[PDB]
Design a protein around this motif. Structure first.
Motif, mmCIF file in Angstrom:
data_model
loop_
_atom_site.group_PDB
_atom_site.id
_atom_site.type_symbol
_atom_site.label_atom_id
_atom_site.label_comp_id
_atom_site.label_asym_id
_atom_site.label_seq_id
_atom_site.Cartn_x
_atom_site.Cartn_y
_atom_site.Cartn_z
ATOM 1 N N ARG A 130 -12.034 -3.293 9.736
ATOM 2 C CA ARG A 130 -10.666 -3.742 9.894
ATOM 3 C C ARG A 130 -10.721 -5.045 10.644
ATOM 4 O O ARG A 130 -11.564 -5.225 11.510
ATOM 5 N N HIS A 162 0.819 -1.210 0.000
ATOM 6 C CA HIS A 162 0.000 0.000 0.000
ATOM 7 C C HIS A 162 0.842 1.243 0.000
ATOM 8 O O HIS A 162 0.517 2.234 -0.657
ATOM 9 N N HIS A 168 -4.612 5.111 5.464
ATOM 10 C CA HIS A 168 -5.725 5.012 4.505
ATOM 11 C C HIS A 168 -6.527 6.319 4.402
ATOM 12 O O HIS A 168 -7.582 6.344 3.793
ATOM 13 N N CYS A 208 -8.325 9.571 3.375
ATOM 14 C CA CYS A 208 -8.853 9.890 2.043
ATOM 15 C C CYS A 208 -7.866 10.641 1.188
ATOM 16 O O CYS A 208 -7.413 11.714 1.542
ATOM 17 N N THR A 224 -20.245 8.544 -2.741
ATOM 18 C CA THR A 224 -19.667 9.462 -1.803
ATOM 19 C C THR A 224 -20.154 10.915 -1.853
ATOM 20 O O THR A 224 -21.077 11.305 -1.130
#
Ligand SMILES: CC[C@H]1/C=C/C=C/C[C@@H](C)[C@H](O)[C@@](C)(O)C(=O)[C@@H](C)[C@H](O)[C@@H](C)C(=O)[C@@H](C)[C@H](O)[C@@H](C)/C=C/C(=O)O[C@@H]2[C@H](C)[C@H](CC1)O[C@]1(CC[C@H](C)[C@H](C[C@@H](C)O)O1)[C@H]2C
Ligand code: HEM
Length: 397
Positions: A287, A90, A344, A346, A236
């Protein structure tokens, strides 16, 4: 063991009170999905934030559902996205994409975004009588904008318009989402080629240049990234705009503060981001813990377990936000988790903000006597899909 999902309350403007009940009582709770399996939900800002920030949690909770596809594009892509990666993988991606997705690009994009809005309002003003804001403004704007950023435009956009709405789909509608996905993977495959031999100032143009250069960034990643962005930023934003206006209209004394006072807007937007959530988890995928974890309140979460950051209520935590269960658009202290936290966080956090700012401003500014074509009672959210979204928003002004 508590039943989750919760009941969906009568009003679209209220939340499950079950959330505040927990946050202010046991705070941490374990839960059962219909499904049968046992999960855990945290409610305190501290705790929620820990879940996202701490590196003993993982966003790999769909890893077999995606392998079990995989072979569809949908599934190939759930495996290839940021929002589903961890660890070093990531980090590399987020790092690679931000070589072009920068605050600067986004800042510089504000002027276009203002025009993108003006234009949709210019069409809104020639449509007849009460008009649905969803279909005619809220759903289109964020694609337009994502398009402008990516480098799609501007023919190609009445096509894309299809593919994009296909993905707004009610999440059950897999075959129809799987279709659009594929159109998109090829479309972007093609767009790359053309962007490479005639670049302009846009996200893709930049990535290619990176990719062609001395970097492992591959065309596939670009494509994945480009769609990741669409899915992530489309539904969103589109939902929020409508929701936000609703919320404003519900609180006219808080809206009057934004009238004739455009410098009040950035704050207002962040207050609604806080107060008006996507889901209970604020759109955050559950998670699961890679190991055992100690919390603020003393409770311990076991290894190999699903965890629900319940952002919707963590953003009203009275330890953090004074007067949290009421809308104050003047709020200066507001460290909300609407865009999450940790690695993570945005990618489009600033972009979102700009869009929302520009959208409200323009509406307020050009259609200030905007009322709901009535009434609060009749409003209705969408059955599926997942995000808290209105089916329609008839308005008059
Ligand atoms: C609030 C949590 C939800 C997460 C939403 C995330 C939204 C992010 C945003 C980018 C989009 O909505 C999206 C692109 O991620 C998105 O919509 C995709 C997930 C989209 O649904 C896509 C994967 C699909 O087409 C989907 C039908 C998949 O093909 C399908 C294989 C999913 C199966 C599945 O079991 O996951 C669901 C899902 C996470 C859903 C919803 C999960 O339901 C699940 C999760 C929640 C409930 C409680 C149970 C628990 C589950 C985690 O075990 O069932 C949970 C079981
Ligand atoms: C109101 C609008 C938006 C909200 C509330 C929102 C909220 C979030 C949240 C909560 C996450 C974290 C999810 C997780 O931790 O698993 C996230 C991640 C992400 N967001 Fe958004 N977002 C919005 C709009 C956008 C837009 C417009 C873009 C445009 C590019 C965008 C880029 C995406 C990406 C790519 C990620 C994944 C980043 C990563 O995992 O490293 N978002 N968003």
């Amino acid at each position: 063991p508590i039943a989750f999902p919760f009941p969906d309350p009568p009003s679209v403007c209220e939340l499950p009170p079950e959330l505040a009940e927990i946050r202010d009582g046991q705070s941490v709770v374990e839960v059962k999905f219909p499904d049968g399996i046992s999960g855990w939900m945290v409610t305190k800002h501290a705790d929620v934030r820990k879940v996202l920030v701490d590196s003993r949690f993982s966003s790999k909770v769909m890893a077999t559902a995606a392998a079990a596809m995989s072979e569809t594009e949908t599934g190939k892509l759930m495996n290839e996205s940021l929002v589903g990666m961890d660890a070093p993988e990531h980090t590399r991606l987020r790092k690679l994409v931000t070589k072009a997705f920068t605050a600067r690009r986004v800042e510089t994009l504000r002027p276009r975004i203002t025009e993108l809005v003006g234009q949709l309002l210019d069409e809104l003003e020639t449509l007849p009588r009460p008009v649905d804001l969803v279909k005619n403004f809220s759903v289109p704007l964020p694609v337009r904008v994502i398009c402008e950023l990516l480098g799609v435009p501007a023919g190609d956009q009445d096509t894309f318009h299809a593919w994009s709405n296909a993905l707004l789909g009610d999440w059950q509608q897999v075959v129809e989402k799987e279709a659009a996905t594929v159109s998109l993977v090829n479309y972007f495959g093609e767009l790359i080629a053309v962007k490479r031999e005639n670049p302009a100032d846009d996200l893709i143009s930049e990535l290619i240049a990176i990719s062609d250069g001395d970097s492992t960034l591959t065309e596939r990643e670009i494509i994945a990234l480009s769609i990741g962005i669409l899915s992530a930023g489309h539904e969103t934003t589109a939902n929020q705009i409508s929701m936000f206006l609703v919320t404003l209209l519900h609180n006219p004394e808080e809206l009057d503060k934004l009238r004739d006072n455009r410098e009040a807007i950035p704050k207002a937007v962040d207050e609604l981001l806080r107060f008006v959530p996507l889901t209970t988890t604020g759109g955050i995928i559950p998670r699961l813990t890679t190991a055992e974890v100690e919390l603020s309140g003393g409770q311990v979460l076991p290894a190999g377990a699903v965890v629900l950051p319940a952002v919707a209520t963590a953003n009203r935590d009275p330890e953090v936000f004074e007067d949290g269960e009421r809308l104050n658009v003047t709020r200066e202290n507001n460290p909300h988790l609407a865009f999450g936290a940790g690695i993570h966080h945005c990618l489009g956090a600033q972009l979102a903000r700009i869009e929302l700012q520009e959208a409200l401003g323009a509406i307020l500014d050009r259609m200030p006597q905007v009322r709901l074509a009535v009434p609060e009672s009749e409003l209705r959210l969408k059955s599926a899909s997942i995000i808290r979204g209105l089916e329609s928003l008839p308005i008059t002004w």
